[PDB]
Design an enzyme around this catalytic site. Structure first.
Site, PDB file in Angstrom:
ATOM      1  CG  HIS C  43      -0.366   0.353   2.498  1.00  0.00           C
ATOM      2  ND1 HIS C  43       0.091  -0.620   3.362  1.00  0.00           N
ATOM      3  CD2 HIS C  43      -0.145   1.538   3.114  1.00  0.00           C
ATOM      4  CE1 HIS C  43       0.567  -0.047   4.453  1.00  0.00           C
ATOM      5  NE2 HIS C  43       0.436   1.261   4.328  1.00  0.00           N
ATOM      6  CG  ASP C  99       0.011  -3.922   2.803  1.00  0.00           C
ATOM      7  OD1 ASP C  99      -0.205  -3.161   3.772  1.00  0.00           O
ATOM      8  OD2 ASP C  99       0.488  -3.542   1.710  1.00  0.00           O
ATOM      9  CB  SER C 198       2.884   2.363   5.983  1.00  0.00           C
ATOM     10  OG  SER C 198       1.669   2.836   6.513  1.00  0.00           O
TER      11      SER C 198
END
Ligand SMILES: N=C(N)c1ccc(CNC(=O)C2(NC(=O)[C@@H](CC3CCCCC3)NCC(=O)O)CCCC2)cn1
Lengths: 34, 10, 250
Positions: C43, C99, C198
């Site tokens: 992502h 992911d 992230s």
């Protein structure tokens, strides 16, 4: 082995037998505590 | 952020 | 990172910073797994809901860093991307299943005291350490509160949580390629990853051979460090085979 020889061994720590400030909290939880 | 040298812009 | 502390020098020699060329800003965390490959969350590169779709020549990889905004001359190394690889079955439409993404560097990076690769788990290591109660470590330059940033690299140690508890804390359909971590509301302590972390690594130190292994990748959460809520990570070992595949092919 699965991950080239030498991986995971930090130059400024494991390589000189020095522990970082909180890595023990991790090892102490590998049995029962937390 | 502090600017990074130009030689790295490709 | 919320409720963590300043990492010490060389504490995470595999920590990687995904850096945007224009405008020059932080994008995500990532990790060095060899002298030519960095691991990160998919992502970070692709997410249609926000029109985000970065290409190789759009980013830079900064390895060996500690400070968040300074160009640490002589210490950090900046590398260019040769090719990016998103997991073919990455599910950005529903729950961010799988992911994960691999990045091939244009040139092999030279290791040093501040640049060293983390290990990828094997079946045995994952089975021994990936258990509820066992703590792991997350690091990143992400935000410090749900809704200023850190000056230096942050780090927290969090316990892996029982799958059932993870499921009952969200409406998002949880899959096998995920696992959650964080302290429970009654456990007293707290901490969590947050916006900007992230792609970062969730690591554990093997008590058998003393090496550090990356078990997870910072994927998603609902807010940051909220009671009854936990951070979710991509289960690296479950995707290990796709990783080996991509590596020996390219
Ligand atoms: N451990 C945490 N608390 C934590 C929080 C935030 C992050 C960074 N990642 C993100 O913000 C992304 N979005 C999120 O986390 C979403 C929840 C996603 C669940 C899967 C389907 C898409 C929505 N929450 C935003 C928030 O309520 O804030 C953006 C694109 C997908 C991930 C990582 N970890």
């Amino acid at each position: 082995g699965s991950g080239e020889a030498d991986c995971g061994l930090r130059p400024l720590f494991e390589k000189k037998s020095l522990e970082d400030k909180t890595e023990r909290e991790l090892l102490e939880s590998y049995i029962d505590g937390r | 952020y502090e600017p990074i040298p130009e030689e790295f812009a490709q | 990172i919320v409720e963590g502390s300043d990492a010490e020098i060389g504490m995470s020699p595999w920590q990687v910073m995904l850096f945007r060329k224009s405008p020059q800003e932080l994008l995500c965390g990532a990790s060095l797994i060899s002298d030519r490959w960095v691991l990160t969350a998919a992502h970070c590169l692709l997410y249609p809901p926000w029109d985000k779709n970065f290409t190789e020549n759009d980013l830079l990889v900064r390895i060996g860093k500690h400070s968040r905004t300074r160009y640490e001359r002589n210490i950090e190394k900046i590398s260019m991307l040769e090719k990016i690889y998103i997991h073919p079955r990455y599910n950005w439409r529903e729950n961010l299943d799988r992911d994960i993404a691999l990045m091939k560097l244009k040139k092999p990076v030279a290791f040093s005291d501040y640049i060293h690769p983390v290990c990828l788990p094997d079946r045995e290591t994952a089975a021994s350490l990936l258990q509820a109660g066992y703590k792991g470590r997350v690091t990143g330059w992400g935000n410090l509160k749900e809704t200023g940033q850190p000056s230096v690299l942050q780090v927290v140690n969090l316990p892996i949580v029982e799958r059932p508890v993870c499921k009952d804390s969200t409406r998002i359909r949880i899959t096998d390629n995920m696992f959650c971590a964080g302290y429970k509301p009654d456990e007293g302590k707290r901490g969590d990853a947050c916006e900007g972390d992230s792609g970062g690594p969730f690591v554990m130190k093997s008590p058998f051979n003393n090496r550090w292994y990356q078990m997870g990748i910072v994927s998603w959460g609902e807010g940051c460090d909220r009671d009854g809520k936990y951070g979710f990570y991509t289960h690296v070992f479950r995707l290990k085979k796709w990783i080996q595949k991509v590596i020996d092919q390219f």
